[PDB]
Design an enzyme around this catalytic site. Structure first.
Site: not given
Ligand SMILES: Cc1cc2nc3c(=O)[nH]c(=O)nc-3n(C[C@H](O)[C@H](O)[C@H](O)COP(=O)(O)OP(=O)(O)OC[C@H]3O[C@@H](n4cnc5c(N)ncnc54)[C@H](O)[C@@H]3O)c2cc1C
Ligand SMILES: O=C1O/C(=C\c2cccc3ccccc23)C(O)=C1c1ccc(Cl)cc1
Length: 341
Positions: A158, A228, A324
């Site tokens: 991240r 998260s 995050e």
């Molecule tokens: C249900 C759910 C599940 C998720 N699961 C995950 C997961 O499993 N793993 C994971 O890593 N993340 C997860 N996320 C978070 C999210 O999917 C990511 O962080 C994704 O990269 C954000 O994309 P976005 O276009 O919505 O960004 P936004 O929320 O629109 O922007 C996020 C940040 O990036 C910046 N930004 C966006 N576009 C640009 C650009 N073109 N240039 C410069 N800066 C920019 C924005 O200024 C802001 O600071 C989850 C979110 C939800 C709601």
């Molecule tokens: O359910 C989860 O388990 C996560 C990480 C881990 C899962 C299982 C064992 C682990 C052990 C160590 C560190 C992280 C995890 C995680 O990162 C999510 C998660 C991701 C996105 C959303 Cl939106 C909600 C939960």
């Protein structure tokens, strides 16, 4: 002026001075100079799936909707040049339909493709750095193009260069991906370990991951959220050892540098925080690390609840959780950790 509620998955209803959808790189650059010449701050947004608006944004919000998917063939891999405005899951779904596996473990992750390298999107044992070839950015002040290689992005858990020295001045316009033709399935996580490695196909993993996420993860459409809320805390080797002496059942994975990633959802669950509510903000009953907009949640409510979750995990485990989800003040990005501290 304009409600940001439709432009964030958390469902926070704050106002922005002006909102514009950029269809290409030059339109984004044009919208920059104008707002910058007007003395306004400018925030580049994607799908808004990981942002927490703390108050009315007193500036222009440029929604990145730059489309395009180009495919280039090399003997040992497929190279994809994807526009920053492309939906990530749609791209993941598209690549598998065309017979180009590699992104199947990252299925159903919300947000645009331009935001994928910013916090190195990762799920089920795979992160974007595994398949990222390069990232295209434009210096917003000058319009000068920069192609950072995967190594130059400094990818981490991240974390990337776009959260540090490439944060403010640059806007991502395209993302380069390399998909090896010799496919290697990543099945060392959760219920993917129950798939047969000999017969497993990219579609079987994709469908498996999509079903796991749909059934287990909270849906923003039911109750607004930004996934998260906290990162899984990456602590030192000695800090992890001292914690594991007292709490030996704590889920943990060793990292490349020798640090230890602890499970945030576990630590929060051990403090009995599931279902805890501050106003309209709530801790989800399944995924404890996911804060949700339960009933017209104020942005103060979420920050107040996030502090309370951080304090209880801090007093019990001596591990201090960092958000995050990115925090947006009146004039742009602010320190999320300082806001919840
Ligand atoms: C249900 C759910 C599940 C998720 N699961 C995950 C997961 O499993 N793993 C994971 O890593 N993340 C997860 N996320 C978070 C999210 O999917 C990511 O962080 C994704 O990269 C954000 O994309 P976005 O276009 O919505 O960004 P936004 O929320 O629109 O922007 C996020 C940040 O990036 C910046 N930004 C966006 N576009 C640009 C650009 N073109 N240039 C410069 N800066 C920019 C924005 O200024 C802001 O600071 C989850 C979110 C939800 C709601
Ligand atoms: O359910 C989860 O388990 C996560 C990480 C881990 C899962 C299982 C064992 C682990 C052990 C160590 C560190 C992280 C995890 C995680 O990162 C999510 C998660 C991701 C996105 C959303 Cl939106 C909600 C939960």
């Amino acid at each position: 002026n304009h409600s940001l509620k439709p432009w964030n998955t958390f469902g926070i209803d704050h106002n922005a001075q002006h909102i514009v959808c950029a269809e290409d790189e030059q339109q984004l650059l044009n919208a920059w100079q104008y707002a910058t010449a007007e003395g306004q701050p400018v925030l580049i947004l994607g799908e808004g799936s990981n942002v927490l608006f703390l108050e009315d944004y007193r500036g222009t919000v440029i929604i990145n909707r730059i489309k395009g998917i180009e495919i280039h063939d090399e003997p040992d891999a497929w190279y994809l040049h994807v526009g920053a405005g492309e939906n990530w899951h749609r791209l993941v779904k598209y690549t598998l339909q065309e017979g180009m596996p590699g992104l199947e473990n990252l299925a159903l992750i919300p947000g645009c493709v331009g935001s994928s390298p910013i916090q190195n999107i990762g799920a089920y044992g795979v992160e974007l750095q595994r398949v990222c070839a390069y990232v295209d950015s434009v210096e917003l002040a000058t319009g000068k193009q920069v192609r950072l290689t995967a190594k130059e992005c400094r990818f981490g858990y991240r974390d990337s260069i776009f959260k540090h020295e490439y944060q403010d001045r640059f806007a991502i316009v395209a993302v380069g991906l390399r998909l090896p033709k010799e496919w290697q399935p990543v099945l060392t996580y959760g219920d993917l370990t129950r798939l047969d490695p000999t017969t497993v196909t990219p579609q079987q993993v994709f469908n498996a991951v999509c079903h796991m996420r749909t059934t287990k993860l909270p849906d923003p459409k039911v109750n607004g959220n930004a996934g998260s809320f906290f990162k899984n805390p990456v602590v030192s080797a000695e800090t992890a050892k001292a914690l594991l002496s007292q709490f030996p059942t704590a889920p943990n994975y060793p990292q490349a540098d020798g640090s230890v990633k602890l499970a945030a959802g576990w630590l929060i669950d051990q403090c009995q925080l599931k279902g805890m509510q501050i106003g309209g903000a709530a801790v989800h009953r399944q995924q404890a690390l996911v804060l949700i907009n339960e009933d017209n949640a104020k942005s103060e409510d979420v920050v107040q609840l996030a502090h309370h979750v951080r304090q209880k995990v801090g007093e019990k485990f001596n591990v201090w959780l960092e958000p995050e989800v990115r925090f947006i003040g009146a004039s742009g990005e602010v320190s999320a950790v300082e806001t919840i501290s």
